[PDB]
Amino acid sequence: GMDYNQTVLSHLQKFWKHHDIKGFTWTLGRIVEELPDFQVFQVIPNHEDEPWVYVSSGIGQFLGQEFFIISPFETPEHIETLAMLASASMHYPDQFQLGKTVNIGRPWVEQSSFRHFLISLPYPYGQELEYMDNVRFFWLLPITQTERLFLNTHSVEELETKFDEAGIDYLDINRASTVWQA
């Protein structure tokens, strides 16, 4: 509800003290029945060399975590994606845990080929963002289609090693895959 959403907003505002943050709500849609008062918060860049961050608010009251997307540009695609994930996480909470992949059902942004996220610790931001009393903030990291397939026969730890070693640019909608299979 409102009090919980304000706790999330305060948490984000404290972490990004000098950024404007916009909140979004629904008065129509899956949200209204399935997760009343759910919000998305948008952390707005101060300059062209900074990304946009979209953060859920409301999932953590049931799941113990919220999720965020780091985007190279402004797009309501992420608002739409997070509403879909709010519904999915209420139905299938076991699939919305660290180390799980999320099938977006479409590219994360239109021109990318990446259709999955890997639910990750918030490596770009650290522990000050990760924890807020009773609730954690996990990163929806886009992964390539071949990376997703790789996770069927290899661990998340192995993939995360490949990510560290490549130094993946998670803001590049066309970054190279870090894995190849025969």
Automatic annotation (TrEMBL):
This is Suppressor of fused family protein. It comes from the Bacteria. Residues 79-175 form the Suppressor of fused-like domain.
